[PDB]
Each structure stands twice: as C-alpha cells, then as structure tokens.
Design a protein around this ligand. Structure first.
Ligand SMILES: CC(=O)N[C@H]1[C@@H](OC[C@H](N)C(=O)O)O[C@H](CO)[C@H](O)[C@@H]1O
Ligand SMILES: [Ca+2]
Length: 899
C-alpha cells in the first residue's frame, strides 16, 4: 500500500499524485466523464501496457490520450480542501481522502457518489487489487464471454483466457465491467484477472489483475448505451458484419479425408445421392481400407464427397447459405497439389463456384497466415494475401491452435488479418472474422463464436442464451455459435429449437464433420427440415431490420439485448429472471425453449416468460395473440413448430422477400410490418453490404414514423416514410413500397401522398387483385407473416392486416404519407385489466424440495400469472433459502388486493 497522499499537482498534461511512500500516480482527464488513473511503480508512465510478446503491436485503445484533446484537462481544477484533495470539472468531482488515499467520484449531473474505494489499492502476491463499495441495488455486467452467465452481482468472474467452451468457462475474456450505479472500468493490462462482485461481503466489490502496475480507464454515464459508447470510443467501435455474415455458414474440411462404402447401419455411415452408405476416415485411420478421397471441387470421380456437392445440397433443400469454409479441419488444407500456388488455384475454382451460387468463401486457420518467405512459399504454408487477392476469400475463422495463447496474441492476429482483407481488396471487402480468446478491443476487427460443445441436448441451448446476452453487454455485438454443436446430435427437438432461437441472433455456424450426424439444417426428418427452413427464411426476410440493429450496435446498444437495456426501470430485467430471454433489437422479445419439459400433448412447457411493463401489449409474432406486460408467465404451451417471440406493440419491422443470400434480395422494393401503438419510429440503415465504404459515409438511412391510436383503440393512423438520406455503390433509388399494418377491421378510408402529390388508391376486391396490382389497399384476414412456417406447422397461422402497395418512386426525392381513417387493431389481451377491483375476493409443507395453495402470485416482488388453478410451484431456489410471497385473484374488472 502506497500510504497517505502528500500532494496533487497539475502538470503540463496530467495530475501527478505523490504518496507518502514516494510512489506516484498520474490522472489523465480525457473528457468530462472519462479519466485514466495510472499508479506506475517504475515511474516510466509509458502510454501503453507491455504485451506478452514485443511483436504484439495491436493496442487495447483505438483512440490515443492525445486524440481526446486537452480541453477537459484544461477545464479540471485541483483544490486542497482540508482532509481531501478534489479534482473538479463540469462532469465529475474526483475526491481523494489525504490520510487513507481513498478515491470517490461524484457525478455532478446526478449529484451522487457513483464509485467509492473502501480500502486502499493492494499490491500483494504480484497482483493489483481495487476495493469498492457495492450498494444493495447495484448490478454488474461485462467480463467478455462468461459462459452461462450475464449478471454478476454476488458472483466472481475470471478475466482469463480459459480455453474452456462450456458452462462456467470463459470463451473470450475482457477486462471491462460496468455497474448500474453508472460507471465502467477498463483495466489497461494484458494480464489475467478476477472480479469479485461481493460473493463475500455483499457491500464490497474487488477487482484483481496479475502485475504490480495499476492502470485503468473510468467512465461515468447515465445510460447503458452511453457506457457502451464510451467503451467503443476508447477501444474501437464494433465492426459491421457484411450482409452475408448474418446468413448461416457451412464449415468443414473437403481436402483430406476418405469415404469408404459400408453397410447401412454401420457406425458413422451417411447415405449419399448414389443411394449408397459411406463412412468417413482420416488418412491415418484407413489401415487396409480403400475409399474415395474428398476434394473441394469434386473433380476426381468423387463429386458427391466434395465441398461443391454441399453447396448443391443447401440449394436443393432451398436453405439460406451465406458463406462456406472448406478447410476447417486439422492439417486439412485447400489443395492437393505440390505447391501453395497450385492449392490457391484449386481454392479459387471453388470460390468461383460458390460465388456463382451466391455464397462467399472463408478460410479457417490453425496457424500464422504468412509464409516465412512470401516470395518463395512452401506447400502447406498459408498466405492470406494470396488467399484474398487470387482466390477471392472474404472471411476468416481463427482456431484455438492459433490464438490459444490469448491476451495480446489474438488481438495482434485479428488486427493484421483485418488489415490484409482491406489492403488486398482496396477496401472492396470489409473484414468478416470469427474468433475467440479475445480481449478489450477485439470487437473492432472480429466477432466471437463460443467454441466446442456437445449439441443434441437441452444444456446446449440453456447455457448459450445468457452466454450471448453477456457477450453483447461486454461490447461484442457480433456473437455466434455452432448450430446444434460441433459434437453430438441425434435429437430432433433440440435441433429444431436451436435453429428457432438462432434466427434472432447474429452468427450461425454449421460446424460439420465431428458430430453424431452431419451438421446442416437438413440432417433430420422432413418435419425438422421444413421448420429449420421456415426459421432460416424468416431471418432472410428480417434482414433490413437485422442490418439496421447491426448498424445501431456499431455505436450503441448491441443486437442481443439484456432485458435491462430496454426496461431499465424493472428489477426483474437485471436478475436471473432474465437469463433465458432477450430483446432482438428494440421490437422482439425472444424466450427460447431450453429444456425438454412437455405437457400431455407433447407441447413444450415454457416457464418464466417475463413480459415487461404493465402498460405494454406484447403480440405473439406467429398468431397475433395479445398479452399484457408487468407479469412473468409460467406453464406456456409451445408446440414443436413454435418459439416464443413477442412483438412490442408499436413496432415497425422493415422486411424483404425471402432469400437464400444477399444477392437474392429485391433492392427495388421496401416493405414494413407495422403494429401501430401511439407514436413510434424506426431508422432503416442500408449500404453496399460488403465494402469498408460505410466508414467513409457511403450508406443511406430512411426514417419511418407510425402515428396511430394506442393498442386496441380506434382512430387516425398516419405512416410517414421520410426521404432516404445518403448514397453508396449501386444504390437503387426507384423502389415500390408495401405497408403491412396489423388491423382487426377494414378502415373507413386510406389516402396516400407521395412527395406532397395525392396518389389515388383502389380497394382490391380480393388477394389476387392485391398481389397483381399497385396503388391499392386490401384488408386481409388470411395474412401470413411466414408462409413457410404455416406450411411446416400444418396451421394456417392467419392474421388480419391492412396492406397498402405504392408504385415505384424515387425514395430520395419523394416521401410517403399514408393516412388511415378508422384504423383499429383490437384483440382480447391476456391480463388486459391491470386496475385493482374491490368487488373481488382476494405454503404446502408436503412438497418443499416451494408450492402455495385465474390467479397471480408475487415471488420476492416479481408477479407471476397464467396460474389457472388454486395452486402454483416456484423452483430455481438455492438449497435452503427463504423467500416472500402473496397472492391475488384475477377477474374481468381487475385484480384483488394482495395479502
Ligand atoms: C475451439 C476451436 O478452435 N475449435 C475448433 C477446433 O476443434 C478441434 C477439437 N477441439 C479437437 O478435439 O480436436 O478445430 C475444429 C477443426 O475442424 C473446428 O474448427 C473447431 O471449431
Ligand atoms: Ca472431410
């Protein structure tokens, strides 16, 4: 410990703190709510921490201290105020007790102490520990990909390159955490650490990293978006994936292995298009067997075993496919020639075939990406410059055998790789890198996948949902995983459920070749295949919404949003009551099926569906069924065909035609699925979908406003689409417009203004007239949000919608204003009467393992509904914990008093 503070002096560029021991710290003020504190026992105070190898030159920060400017520092004063030294600017008071040396930070906007040290920095055992106050309602997020977890109050997390891909591990650590008090901290170190959020004293948080340096950035902000924007300004804004990255990929090795003809029912046998069964062998495992060697292009009397054959299967099965890695396998390679250049030419011919099918090609790596002599490569070396420039590769996956060292290694590797994609293509290809073993800053170059786990079991879904939520809260919005796992399989229900929820997530990897069955969306029976296709096509139709929330994630909230990001005023949104559900952007609440519990009919039973906000109507995306917020629903029956997805009434959801890749999208059309509820808005983002030009302002945005009656009420609706702002390569100006307005009755009238000139709308007599015509409206009681799902489920899934179509116009030169008189979208709302009713009435010790004796129950101040009998069970409790309950009855004029 460094003892009392003897002085704080304002030097040329920072405040210098001298402690009684002779040790010094520098405080650098970067803006009115961000400062760096650096206690350096060496007295060198160099700008950057020492990495694990001097060749690791990529930095945690993406913005230098100098880049922030001197203005906040100029406008910060140091005062000697009795028992304290105080640094003060317009944003913060940073207060130091002289004798104890303890720091606390007052946020001047809030006029509240946000961060307070309760014990001095500790440097024992070659570690640097900070000890902070923890308040009773204070919650904590971050730490990177904390497998299984998102909300850290009362727990410790390891900030370690664990190389552990399952529940309880850390696939990708990040020395970044933030507090709901309104602060975030990046420890400016490459060393591992451990953050203890009061797992001992609930009133104490400790943060530890290896080393004797204490260097940290502290940022104070009153919104979660603001905390993440501070982290992004400091360590780099997330890369925006190219459009094709949001589509499922196929990953395997097609250069190395043999297929041996075997009997049907042989262990590991797979049936092929010749009607025969084969078993796959690595060359070292053939022994005396003869088999057919795989290749990428199927040029060697081996076509069905080739990478091209796999692309042909995705197309035959009418499945979306964005990108393909054909060298994903140890020592597999991408050519069977005697030279690197021979192999690159083989990969080029594969890329030409894939691109002719609307598929991009990526490469896996287990190694460095450059030859020892780039001008004289050896067979089996890698050359990412030639792979990109000659073979047309656009994406990269970094395997743990490359980046497994962690910390400064990974960031160096992905920064170099991102630079090669951009430099070799002159900016025509933006990075598409999937990695792990990341650190602070990784998001600016790469997304992560969670590593290797076993699918075909419910645990595969259960631990992944919080994994994705916590990755996103750590400043990494580009998160993905294997579709039904790299290992295991042979469980149809888990396969369908994994394709269902991952529709509403960024990255989907069919990681093939290691499992109990091949890894494709068409590996199970026709029912599974049709359901997986229906969900994959829904993601394709949602790409304008998805790419808009992706753009928001570059400098704002992530795509997978913890409930607390959208509903910060509700306690339930911060706890494990929110571990198995999330907001996919602002408009969709996703509550995946994650266990095998079923009703007598074989429907999944979903417990703990948390619907926020007692004033908010939630609408079943598939059926139109309406639910009141402010409640947690238990016992929700969910058929195999269905995943629980609720639209936030008010939502505008930009949509497109179903498509198997970005080249199949109709760029001369736009379409909006709108659930009118008061005054709502959406900003639709677009760009060339592939280049770095979005970073130089080549992109366009379109604002859509919906101004109507509140949920279930009748009145005027105005939908306005403001003129499109911006331009980019091959921008399409002339587009037709479709509005699909969920509605319960035909309107009194529908009128249209296009750039201030009236357009006459005819009422279509029938759906056939509507589909074939333009400048029409139609009130449709057979509106299907997803016809693939109607056909796959065997249910019509009909909804009522007022649809409007306008002819092609210039989207830049002319706005759209549509006015509907007598607009109404009314249905019965489950829990719709939230008032208290005076006219309404009001522990079973036997099966404690708790059960009390329709109805609602408050459990620790959280309200549970859909309780349709006198009794109800609440599980998910600690072995010998205590809880607090009361009950009320539910009738058509409201709910009783409690108890
Ligand atoms: C974590 C990771 O890099 N996983 C890779 C790696 O898996 C190898 C497994 N763990 C093994 O036991 O050998 O390499 C395979 C190659 O096909 C996959 O890329 C996987 O994602
Ligand atoms: Ca193979």
């Amino acid at each position: 410990s460094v003892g009392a503070i003897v002085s704080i002096e304002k030097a040329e560029k920072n405040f210098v703190i001298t402690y009684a021991s002779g040790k010094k710290a520098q405080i650098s003020i970067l803006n009115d709510h961000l400062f760096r504190y650096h206690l350096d026992p060496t007295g060198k105070f160099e700008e950057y921490p020492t990495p694990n190898d001097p060749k690791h030159v990529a930095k945690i920060t993406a913005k230098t201290m100098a880049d922030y400017g001197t203005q906040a520092f100029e406008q910060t004063n140091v005062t000697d105020s009795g028992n304290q030294f105080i640094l003060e600017n317009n944003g913060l008071k940073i207060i130091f007790e002289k004798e104890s040396a303890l720091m606390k930070v007052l946020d001047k906007k809030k006029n509240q102490v946000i961060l307070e040290e309760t014990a001095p920095l500790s440097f024992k055992n070659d570690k640097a520990t900070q000890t902070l106050k923890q308040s009773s309602q204070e919650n904590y997020f971050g730490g990177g990909t904390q497998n299984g977890r998102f909300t850290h109050k009362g727990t410790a997390i390891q900030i370690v390159n664990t190389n552990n891909w399952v529940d309880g591990g850390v696939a990708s650590p990040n020395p970044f955490y933030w507090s709901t008090a309104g602060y975030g901290v990046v420890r400016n170190t490459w060393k591992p650490g451990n953050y203890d959020f009061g797992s001992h004293d609930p009133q104490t948080t400790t943060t530890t990293h290896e080393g004797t340096d204490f260097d940290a950035f502290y940022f104070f902000n009153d919104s979660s978006a603001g905390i993440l924007k501070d982290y992004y300004e400091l360590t780099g804004k997330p890369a925006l994936m190219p459009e094709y990255g949001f589509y499922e990929a196929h990953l395997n090795a097609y250069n190395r292995d043999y297929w041996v003809k075997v009997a049907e029912g042989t262990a590991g046998a797979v049936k092929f298009e010749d009607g025969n069964f084969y078993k796959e062998y690595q060359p070292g495992d053939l022994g005396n067997l003869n088999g057919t060697l795989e290749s990428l292009n199927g040029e060697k009397e081996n076509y069905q075993f080739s990478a091209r054959a796999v692309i042909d299967r995705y197309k035959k099965n009418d499945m979306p496919l964005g990108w393909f890695l054909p060298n994903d396998g140890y020592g597999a390679g991408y050519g069977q020639t005697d030279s690197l250049d021979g192999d690159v030419q083989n990969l080029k011919e594969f890329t030409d075939y894939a691109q002719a099918n609307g598929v991009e090609v990526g490469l896996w790596t287990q190694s460095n990406l450059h030859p020892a002599d780039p001008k004289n490569p050896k067979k089996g070396e890698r050359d990412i410059a030639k792979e990109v420039s000659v073979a047309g590769v656009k994406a990269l996956k970094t395997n743990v055998a490359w980046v497994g060292y962690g910390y400064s290694f990974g960031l160096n590797g992905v920064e170099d790789a991102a630079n090669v994609f951009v430099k070799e293509t002159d900016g025509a290809v933006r990075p598409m890198i999937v990695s792990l073993d990341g650190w602070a800053g990784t998001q600016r170059h790469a997304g992560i996948w969670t590593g290797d786990q076993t699918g075909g079991q419910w645990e595969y879904i259960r631990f992944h949902i919080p994994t994705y939520i916590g990755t996103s809260l750590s400043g990494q919005p580009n998160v993905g995983s294997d579709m039904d796992g790299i290992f295991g399989g042979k469980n149809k229900e888990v396969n369908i459920r994994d394709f269902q929820w991952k529709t509403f997530t960024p990255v989907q990897l069919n990681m093939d070749g290691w499992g109990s069955n091949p890894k494709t969306p068409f590996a199970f029976d026709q029912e599974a295949t049709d359901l997986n296709r229906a969900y994959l096509k829904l993601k394709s139709m949602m790409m304008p919404y998805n790419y808009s929330i992706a753009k928001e994630s570059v400098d704002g909230l992530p795509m997978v949003r913890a409930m607390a990001l959208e509903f910060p005023n509700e306690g339930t949104a911060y706890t494990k009551d929110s571990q198995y559900q999330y907001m996919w952007g602002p408009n969709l609440l996703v509550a995946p099926i994650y266990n095998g519990n079923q009703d007598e009919a074989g429907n999944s039973i979903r417990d703990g569906i948390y619907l926020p906000d007692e004033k908010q109507v939630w609408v079943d995306l598939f059926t139109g069924e309406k639910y009141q917020g402010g409640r947690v629903l238990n016992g929700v029956k969910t058929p195999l065909w269905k995943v629980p997805v609720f639209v936030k009434d008010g939502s505008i959801i930009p949509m497109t035609n179903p498509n198997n890749n970005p080249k199949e999208i109709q760029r001369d059309q736009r379409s909006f699925l709108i659930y009118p509820n008061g005054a709502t808005s959406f900003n639709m983002y677009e760009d060339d979908g592939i280049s770095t030009s979005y970073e130089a302002g080549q992109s366009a945005t379109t604002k859509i406003n919906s101004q109507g009656p509140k949920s279930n009420e009748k009145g005027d609706l105005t939908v306005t689409i403001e003129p499109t702002k911006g331009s980019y390569k091959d921008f399409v100006d002339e587009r037709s417009t479709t509005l699909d307005l969920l509605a319960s009755e035909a309107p009194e009238s529908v009128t249209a203004m296009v750039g201030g000139t009236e357009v006459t709308l005819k009422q279509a007599a029938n759906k056939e007239e509507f589909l074939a015509g333009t400048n029409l409206y139609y009130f449709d009681k057979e509106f299907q949000v997803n016809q693939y799902l109607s056909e796959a489920s065997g249910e019509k899934l009909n909804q009522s919608a007022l649809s409007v179509k306008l002819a092609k116009q210039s989207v830049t030169a002319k706005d759209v204003q549509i006015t509907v008189k007598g607009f109404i979208n009314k249905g019965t709302v489950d829990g719709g009467n939230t008032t208290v009713d005076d006219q309404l009435t009001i522990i079973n010790e036997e099966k404690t393992t708790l059960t009390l004796q329709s109805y609602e129950v408050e459990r620790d101040g959280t309200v549970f509904g859909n309780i349709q009998t006198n009794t109800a069970t609440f599980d998910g409790f600690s072995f010998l914990s205590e809880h607090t309950f009361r009950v009320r009855a539910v009738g058509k004029n409201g709910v009783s008093e409690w108890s």
